[PDB]
């Protein structure tokens, strides 16, 4: 439940890559496999 | 599954006796195969055990917080003071025999999760039940007692096995099977069937 409430989605150059700037803001690990991997993020 | 990306289904349950045992008389609630470790490099798992062991012993909450100065040594050092081999190994005896096990074993407590998705909730198994009205083909899902998908890919395999007959029997006698009458001049299903 906590994890669902803290979720993030990104519709649609490289967007599923964990990105430098993400440090501090989005969890580096938590993310679904395949399908929407890297698109669905978790604060 | 542990807490380190290592899931597994039960494969059999053994009663206390058949289980390998500790000289202290302690026996495991669960046994995992050493082989699911070298490759997954999920070391923390191992560590956590070292820690959780010491902890349970000394009634101290084990602190496996990330970036800390907690060492596998400092811990092994603590566990020894507790009269146990500093790594988690402990001579163990084979339940059947009572003899000692030629190889000491990694024994300790480790937090394990009970994941949803339990066999009984999946065991579907049909043998010709209800079929779709539109295609006269078996229905989907097991809640409905449907059929399993013998899709494209499975077919190719059968073709590869050169098992012609089976194939026909799969794509016909089971699922779609229908008799149609045709005009010996215009191969169309335009022949009025008046059977009597």
């Amino acid at each position: 439940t906590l994890s669902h409430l803290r979720r993030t989605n990104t519709p649609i150059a490289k967007p599923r890559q964990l990105h430098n700037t993400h440090w501090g803001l989005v969890c580096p690990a938590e993310t679904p496999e395949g399908q929407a991997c890297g698109l669905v993020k978790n604060l | 599954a542990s807490r380190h990306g290592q899931k597994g289904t039960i494969g059999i349950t053994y009663r206390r006796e058949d289980m390998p045992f500790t000289a202290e008389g302690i026996v495991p609630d669960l046994i995992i195969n050493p082989h699911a470790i070298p490759s997954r490099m999920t070391v923390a798992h191992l560590i956590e055990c070292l820690l959780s062991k010491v902890a349970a012993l000394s009634g101290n909450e084990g602190d496996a917080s990330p970036f800390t100065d907690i060492t596998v040594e400092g811990i092994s050092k603590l566990l020894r003071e507790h009269g146990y081999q500093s790594r988690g190994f402990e001579v163990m005896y084979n339940g059947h025999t009572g003899k000692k096990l030629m190889a000491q074993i990694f024994f300790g407590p480790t937090y394990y999760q009970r994941l949803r998705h339990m066999v009984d909730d999946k065991i579907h198994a049909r043998a010709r039940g209800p079929m779709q009205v539109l295609t006269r083909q078996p229905v989907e899902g097991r809640s409905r007692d449907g059929g399993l998908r013998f899709g494209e890919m499975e077919r190719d395999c059968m073709i590869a096995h050169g098992a012609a007959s089976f194939l026909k029997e799969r794509l016909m006698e089971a699922s779609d099977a229908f008799r149609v009458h045709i005009c010996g001049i215009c191969g169309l299903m335009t022949v009025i069937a008046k059977l009597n």
Partner: protein, 158 residues
């Protein structure tokens, strides 16, 4: 020198080495004619085709050339005598043996090679997941599609 060919001859030999208990101390009863002419004759009964005409009789020769090479280099006079002290009996057996095995290594009409191949390539392909060239899936894709815009072109001159 190591190429996949039907009939592991080396084995047949070993399987005579002890099926007839061959002693490396006494002399064989093999006639130079036996061996040489025998090996030769063996090469006549391998077959993969049976038309009685020129064309096909020539294909048949082609499809056996290599194996035969293997066969000749292995079943050579010295070898037979000096390398593995066979005897007219063992040797004679080894031959009758190869023939049969060969005949057993032929493909059976019906074998659906189309798929059998497609899959034999698709599978080990789905095992691929990773000195600056385009390889792996992408490239294989490049190929199968017969693309013209390949990313890593190159010309290798000597």
């Amino acid at each position: 020198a190591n190429w996949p060919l039907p009939v592991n001859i080396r084995r047949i030999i070993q399987n005579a080495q002890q099926t007839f208990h061959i002693d490396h101390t006494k002399p064989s009863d093999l006639t130079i004619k036996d061996i040489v002419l025998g090996v030769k004759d063996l090469q006549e009964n391998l077959l993969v085709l049976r038309g009685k005409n020129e064309i096909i009789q020539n294909a048949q020769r082609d499809a056996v050339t290599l194996f035969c090479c293997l066969l000749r280099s292995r079943l050579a006079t010295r070898r037979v005598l000096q390398e593995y002290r066979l005897t007219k009996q063992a040797f004679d057996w080894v031959l009758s043996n190869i023939e049969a095995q060969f005949l057993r290594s032929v493909v059976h009409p019906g074998e659906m090679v189309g798929v059998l191949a497609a899959q034999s390539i698709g599978e080990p392909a789905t095992q691929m997941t990773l000195k600056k060239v385009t390889s792996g899936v992408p490239r294989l894709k490049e190929i199968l599609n017969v693309a013209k815009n390949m990313k890593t072109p190159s010309l290798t001159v000597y």
